[PDB]
Design a protein around this nucleic acid. Sequence first.
DNA 1: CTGTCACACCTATTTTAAGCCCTTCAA
DNA 2: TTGAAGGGCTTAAAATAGGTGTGACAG
Lengths: 178, 302
Amino acid sequence: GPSGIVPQLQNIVSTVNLGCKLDLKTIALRARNAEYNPKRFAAVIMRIREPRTTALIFSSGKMVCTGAKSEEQSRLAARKYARVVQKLGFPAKFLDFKIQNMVGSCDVKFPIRLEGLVLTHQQFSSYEPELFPGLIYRMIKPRIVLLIFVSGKVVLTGAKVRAEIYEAFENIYPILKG
Amino acid sequence: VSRSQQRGLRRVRDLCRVLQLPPTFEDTAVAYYQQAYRHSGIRAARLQKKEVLVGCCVLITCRQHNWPLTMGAICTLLYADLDVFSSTYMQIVKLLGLDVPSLCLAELVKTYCSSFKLFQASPSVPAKYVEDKEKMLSRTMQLVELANETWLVTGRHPLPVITAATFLAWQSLQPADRLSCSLARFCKLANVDLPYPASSRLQELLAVLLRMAEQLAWLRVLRLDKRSVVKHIGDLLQHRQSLVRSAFRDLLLPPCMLKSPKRICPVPPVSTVTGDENISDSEIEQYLRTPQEVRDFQRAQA
DNA sequence: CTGTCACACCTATTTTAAGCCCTTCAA
DNA sequence: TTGAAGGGCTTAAAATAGGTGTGACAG
Ligand SMILES: [Mg+2]
């Protein structure tokens, strides 16, 4: 008996190794979409318009890609940053691409007594309203962290694959309902 | 034997003595600080974290004995950043594997309400503003329990709820002479800081009492407002359990649910991306500076 | 009294949630 | 006076990494 609610993917974090050392001053000077403030942060901040994402490019050749709404979009965006870096004169490669984190969200559309949930599911729950309005639920199977709000809105994070977000939500729904 | 541990254990004891805690609390808090220091993650932490850890260990001890110490009050006494206190507290509870009891609202109502200097007349507290301490505590507690039953406490800071409830209890005990006094003027004469969310909590509590008033025919006919409802608070609290059940029976929800009109759902676009599509040279070239753009930038940095 | 060692943990990127808390501005 | 509105923080995840805080080791 499924809930009939499908969590929406909000953000994907992926990594890739461009397999060569990079001169960040050269990238900042010769790219249009690069932001570089070494005294503030040691990496280049690069942005492309489609898929709309942000990349962090390190002098080691390692790269982090953020903001995509699908694992496919994250891969296409990562390949585009690699192609920008290649055109800038570097012998960049596309090695060890990996989805590292996925964030999902949904609404159960009924209020939640967080003060009651933290008592019945204490071993997984942390609720400190002097610090944060949501209850932090650390699910073991799958290993997902959920942020549960009084509104019934739920944030799911820490997933490596899409199925882990869906599995964690189907697990929490009967706990929240009854 | 560590110099920062010795300093920490001494600070733990000094905090307990300043707080005038029962004698047993000191030992328990000292043992938590020692337990904390055995973990490598705490041993290698910044001296600022080791300073707020003093407060975390005393707060955990107070929470287990229902002693109503707030995180805000500890940080004020320790001259500590609340955010550093927040991250250290969450870390040490998780690290020591503790099931820390929640803040005891009933005991906070007693301690916080008693600090309101309204029990004796003075140049700043006129005769008509002086109230009985027992009458004050009893009505404040009933208004805090109402706020808790009507979803005004869940996910919020608890102290501004008690500030709003103490003010409303005080006004409702002599409505004819106290309705001209605002929340800000009240906290100033009672000599208590005004918490920023306390005005929002007040307006929510007045709207809840107005929905309850709709359940009594003789009050529904008066077409009450947030000002005229105050003289009937005594009457509404007399039947709070019954009026709350009747209001839910006929939509009573957390304020963040009713409602969010400014929301956009058409922003997400349909996705047909495979991640394997060709990437043309023209698609990439638009992200490159031209030779002129490079020269103009270089000259401007020289 | 230094060097090594193994942690912490600042800067930053993304995204949702609800609350807080500040500046800014309006009749 | 008293609010609304808007910006920027709190919480969770995850990788990327230099510089440096912090204390217990060997030598
Ligand atoms: Mg983090």
